[PDB]
Structure formats: C-alpha cells, structure tokens
Design a protein around this nucleic acid. Structure first.
Lengths: 150, 113, 98, 100, 79
RNA sequence: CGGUCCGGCCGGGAACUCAAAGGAGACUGCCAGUGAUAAACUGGAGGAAGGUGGGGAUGACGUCAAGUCAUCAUGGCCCUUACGACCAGGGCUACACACGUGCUACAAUGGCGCAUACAAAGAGAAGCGACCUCGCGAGAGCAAGCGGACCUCAUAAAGUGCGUCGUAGUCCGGAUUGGAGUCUGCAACUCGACUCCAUGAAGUCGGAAUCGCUAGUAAUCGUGGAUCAGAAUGCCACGGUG
C-alpha cells in the first residue's frame, strides 16, 4: 500500500569513490565472500580503452551512455480495457539500472574465465550491442501507440 | 609417448597424466614421482621413454590390468546356477540395491512395463 | 584446607541463602572476601504448545541454575559444623569439599 | 493406547537385572584365555546365552499415565502430553514464565 | 567378507537336526525360524518353512551350506 | 602503580571485560508549522536511541453448524470360547506411474596440488577421553585431566597465497557398481549407517503455471545437542563471511 518504508539513499565509499562504484562491488553478491569484485571493478577498462572506447577514465562513462534506458513498459487496465503502456524513467538512478544489465550477464553466461565473462560483455555494452535488443525495441515501439490512449 | 595409456592427454605432467588408467587412479602419484627422483614443481624434459612406467609396482597395490575383471563374468556364470539369493538375483532380472518399484523406471522396459 | 558450594534455581533465593552462610561460617573466624555472582547456565526448556495435532509451535520456559562459592579460608572443620546443622531453607543445595 | 506394559515390565526388569545391567563389563574378560587359568566363564556363558526375549531390543520404557512410545522427558520422567496442568501452575521447581 | 560369525541356527532347530542325524532316519519338519543359517549336516533333511500363510518345502544341498533358509527361494512371485 | 622473558605471574586493582541483578535515559516532551489554534498530523533540535520508542506476550461474541474416539476420557449400539488379548511368522523401499516436500550437481569468480589463521555455544564417571599407538580408513587400543567459567570432546571453514587445468555430457558431477574392511544387537541375506582403491549413468539452471521477500534478512561456511540397542542431508541451538 502507501506505507511501505521510505526507500534508501545508498552510500559512496572512501576508496571505491562514487555511489555507483560503491554499488558495483555490492550488487549481485552470492555466497557472501566479499573479496571477488574488488579485483574486477575498474579492471576490465584497459582493454575496453583499446576495443570499444578510449582511456580508463571514459571506458565506463561511455558504457552507461550506450546502455541508456529512457522508457519502461508495463500493462495498464481500466475496467474492460487493457493496454501495454510506455512510461519515462526517472534520471537519478538511471545509470545504476544500466550497470545491473551488464554485471548480471557475466553470471548468466558461462564461457571461459571470469577474467573474460565481464570484459567480453562490456565491449558490446559500450557499443549498444546487447542480446536480443531488436525484439526488445519491438515492444517499446508497439507500446508507443498506446500513449494515444483508447 | 602414451603415458596416459588408452587416453589422449600428453601435454601434461605425470601427476595429472599417469592417472585414471590400467587400474590406478591418483592416490599414489607423488610417491612414484619420488621413486623416479623428480620434483613436482617446474615442467620436465629430462624424463626418458617408459621411465616412470618402469616403476608402476610402487602403485600396483590393486587388481590392476583386470586381474579380477578377466574372471568376474565367469565367476558370475557359476553364481547364476546357485539356488541362493545372490545367484537368483543374477539369473532373474532383478535389482540388489535401490531401484524401488514405487518410482518410475523410465526406459528400462518402456511405458506400461 | 576446605571449601563450600551453594546451588539454587532463583537469584533472590540464593541471596536469601547467602545471608545465612555469611552469618553461619564467616564471622568467627571473620572472613572478608565478598560473593561473586557466577554464571546462571541460562537455557530454554521447550515442549510442543498443544497436546494434539500441532507440532509447529513450542511453549517457552526460562531455566537458570545459580551458583555461589561464597569463599572460606579458615582450615578448621569447625568452619562448617554449624552450616551442616542450621538453615539453609528449602529450595537450595549446599556442598562441603576437600 | 492400551494398559499392557506392566505385564511385560514385571518380567523384563528382572530379565535386565539378571541378564543385562550387570553383564556389560563381563564381556571384557569372559572370552579371554590369557586372563584366566581357572575355569569360571564357560558356565556363565551357557547361562548368559539362555534368554531370548528383549533387554536392549524389543523393549522401550514408555510413559506412566499412558504407554505412548514417545514424549518422555529424560531428565524429568514426565510425558510432554500429561504435564501442562503442573508446568503452568508452577509445580516443577526452577522453571520460570512468562516472556524472555 | 561379512558372514560374519559362521553358521548359526535356532536352538530348537539344532534339536530337530540332532534327532534326524542320530536316528539315521528323516521325517517332515515345519519351521518358523526361516532366518536360520544352515549347518553343513542339514543337507538332504525333510524340511519346510513358514512363508507368512503356510509352510512350504525347501530342498537342502551342499550348494546351500552357509546360507539362510530365506535365501533358498524368492518371497514375491507375482511379478 | 612496584617487581618480572617481560604469562594476572607475584605484590595489588575495577578504568576495561565476564558474570548476573538493581537503578537511571525517552515523554511527542521541546520547538516550528499544519489543523473547526479544538480533537490531531508533518518536520527539526539535542540524543547511543524518536514518534503504538523498536520487538514480543496476546487473540472479543460469532463463522466452517470444520478435524480428533488412533494423544487423554466416554455414551449408546455392536463383538464373547470373540472383532477381546497372550505369542510367533509375515506385511509398510509390494508396481503400470502421477502428486506433495526436499538433497547434490550442471562448476571455471570453478576443479586440483601445496602452505597457513581465528573461534562461539553446548554435552560429559562402566562418562567426555588428552598426549601416544595400531590399522590406507571407518574404528580399536594404552593412558593423564575433570564432575565442570577448571579438564576433555576440539580441529574453525569460507578465506589467504603460489603453481596448474581450461565450458568439456566431460576436465566438473556423482546414481545403480566391482573388491575388501568399520559397527550395534538375538540378528543387519531381505528393509541400516560408515570407510578405502579402481569403474561408471543422468546432469549444459530446468514445462504450462505458480510460490516466497525486505539488514544482519537472502545466500554462504564452520560447531554442538535432542530422539536412540543400531541409523537420518530431518528436528532444536551457537558462530564466522554478508
């Protein structure tokens, strides 16, 4: 209902720096061992800077600029009428949604080493080359007509 | 050459290649290496042909090379004439552990037994 | 030469028994070390909450077993001769060692 | 449940006192030929092999108000289904309530 | 492997054997101690065992020595 | 603070910790706004803690006119050389498949080799059993400490760090196997568990559909104990990584 506790404000880190980098080392935590991601954070960028971008300073800026959700899609009904509806996303966490879509695919794909499973994912993310994105776009494209209502 | 016997792996050190063959697993791989006098660290080129395979009696503490498996089916050809449980269970198609009939047999006889 | 033990199941009853021990053994000879409280062996005693068809909930009871050693230093057997005769009310166990 | 247990207890407590409870350390010397030159064990072995009914097997103590196979509180002797009127009313020393 | 204490039989069955081997003459026996592990002298005796309904005759040979009377035949025969 | 291989150990001592108890702190009290300046919310300060303080104990008449006589009692009908009860042998892993609930994998941030660290809570005298042997090993011996803040069970794992293999129905995974051993008991052939050395099937995150949530929670890795002749990944407690 309406209460619900107030949603959290997260944190930065005194070494990892920004709130998103402090999220990167804490998201998709499994088995709780809490020493695995601190060798993978800002460590896939030196090859990215010679594969799908430039410098270790912009290699992750461009990844969250190529992966940029601007609209969400969801069902909406009003009595005996149902539509798939598009809604604009709020900007404040927009780049953290895009981050999640990369770090999960390195877990859901099982090919060679973990020293490859994320670097190989990021080099397509920095180019907007994600899996099945043509059929993903085909839903948002179909829902665009429902901003005209009935 | 052919340190791994029936199997293909050869770009590998004897402690992971002279394993799972001819009635041996891996339990004594360090001991036979220490009989040859070889260190387990750094890769080797000064090991001669058949050299560690000359020391196999350090690990042959088992019914190696089928010392039992060259008889087991004939031991069963006598067992399957016996008027006892362990003989009956070798002359009618019946299990001796697990295979509880209250569960599905899948393809052991096919749909409806 | 000798030492004592006191056991109970209640914090106020073991005090009510300590009040007798200091009065029965620690005045002649006068003995001055005060009583340390010691651990109470805290545990939950548990049984199924209902006698029929429920096995999901348990009834919760608090168990403690208190200990006092009180400390004695006089070596004579006379130190305990009255404590092995006087009250000490019902609900406590005393023990003489060495 | 039935009230059938005492008709077994009366024979099985004596069966245990004669052929179990005082026969456990005996096993450490009864078969030893180096620990005895005197003939003392052969005859009591022939006695110890006589009973064939229960003792460690086929026999469980069971509760006293009802011969139920389980619910006996080992360090208390009571059944957990015939104790609530005493437990609640503070009749067992040292148990406390409520909320902790 | 296993066994694990050699042949062992009920002490009533030991008497039934003793009576038969000493008489030179065998007569039909019916027994409920079907879990008895047969002695080397039990061969050829006239014996039946309880199946849970009736007694059924069992034929004892040198090939059965060291086994139980429940090892002689199966218990489930409909399948 | 005085002595001291520089250990509370010995003179001594509660600043700290442990043990238990008893007091004190917090109250929407104070402020600013909002509100028939009513009755009552929202936000702030100060605080270790902020708004039924946080969290438990609870369960208002009734409802299904629910289940339970086999947890404990009991009426009436019904059974009597018995449907009662004294025993032994057999049934419950009997089979065509479905349905409920769980366990271990399918890994590669993993697998293997090697080196190396810290527990916490519990139980315990024909007991818990040290140090030490004997057996590949389950276990079995010899033989001190201690009736438990004492001694023993007993060893923290995950991790750490260097080499090595390299998404493969096999390299990982372990079921029905092949062999010899460990054990209680009247006895484990058939219905029980453990160990050692080879072998080896399925397993490439799962059908429709539908189920559960929120910080020390999910997931993850160590320990004890109850039940008990003998045996549980079950049940009940303790702790690390989070």
């Amino acid at each position: 209902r309406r209460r619900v506790i107030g949603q959290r404000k997260i944190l930065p880190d005194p070494k990892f720096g920004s709130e998103l980098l402090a999220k990167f080392v804490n998201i998709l935590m499994v088995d709780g061992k809490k020493s695995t991601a601190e060798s993978i954070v800002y460590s896939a960028l030196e090859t990215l800077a010679q594969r799908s971008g430039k410098s270790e300073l912009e290699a992750f800026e461009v990844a969250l600029e190529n992966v940029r959700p601007t609209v969400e899609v969801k069902s909406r009904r009003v009595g005996g009428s149902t539509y798939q509806v598009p809604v604009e996303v709020r900007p404040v966490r927009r780049n953290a949604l895009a981050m999640r879509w990369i770090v999960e695919a390195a877990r859901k794909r099982g090919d060679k080493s973990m020293a490859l499973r994320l670097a190989n994912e990021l080099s397509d993310a920095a180019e907007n080359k994600g899996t099945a994105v043509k059929k993903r776009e085909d839903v948002h494209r179909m829902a665009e007509a429902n901003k005209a209502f009935a | 050459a052919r340190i791994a016997g029936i199997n293909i792996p050869d770009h590998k050190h004897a402690v992971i290649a002279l394993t799972s063959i001819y009635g041996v697993g891996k339990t004594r791989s360090k001991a036979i290496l220490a009989a040859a006098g070889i260190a387990e660290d750094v890769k080797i080129s000064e090991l001669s042909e058949g050299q560690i395979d000359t020391l196999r009696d350090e690990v042959a503490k088992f019914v190696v090379e089928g010392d039992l498996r060259r008889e087991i089916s004939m031991s069963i050809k006598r067992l399957m004439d016996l008027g006892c449980y362990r003989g009956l269970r070798h002359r009618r198609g019946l299990p001796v552990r697990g295979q509880r009939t209250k569960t599905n047999a899948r393809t052991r006889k096919g749909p409806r037994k | 030469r000798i030492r004592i033990r006191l056991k109970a199941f209640d914090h106020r009853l073991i005090d009510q028994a300590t009040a007798e021990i200091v009065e029965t053994a620690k005045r002649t000879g006068a003995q001055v070390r005060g009583p340390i409280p010691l651990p109470t062996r805290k545990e939950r005693f548990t049984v199924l909450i209902s006698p029929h068809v429920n096995k999901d909930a348990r009834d919760q009871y608090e168990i403690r077993t208190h200990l006092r050693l009180v400390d004695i230093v006089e070596p004579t057997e006379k130190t305990v001769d009255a404590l092995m005769r006087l009250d000490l009310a019902a609900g406590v166990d005393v023990q003489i060692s060495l | 449940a039935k009230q059938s247990m005492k008709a077994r207890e009366v024979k099985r407590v004596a069966l245990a006192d004669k052929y179990f409870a005082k026969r456990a350390e005996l096993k450490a010397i009864i078969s030893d030929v180096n620990a005895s030159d005197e003939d003392r064990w052969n005859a009591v072995l022939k006695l110890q092999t006589l009973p064939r009914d229960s003792s460690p097997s086929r026999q469980r103590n069971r509760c006293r108000q009802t011969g139920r196979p389980h619910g006996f509180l080992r360090k208390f002797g009571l059944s957990r289904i015939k104790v609530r009127e005493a437990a609640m009313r503070g009749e067992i020393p040292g148990l406390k309530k409520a909320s902790w | 492997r296993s066994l694990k204490k050699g042949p062992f039989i009920d002490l009533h069955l030991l008497k039934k054997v003793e009576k038969a081997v000493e008489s030179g003459d065998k007569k039909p026996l019916r027994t409920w101690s079907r879990r008895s592990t047969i002695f080397p002298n039990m061969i050829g005796l006239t014996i039946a065992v309880h199946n849970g309904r009736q007694h059924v005759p069992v034929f004892v040979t040198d090939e059965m020595v060291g086994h139980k009377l429940g090892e002689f035949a199966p218990t489930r025969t409909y399948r």
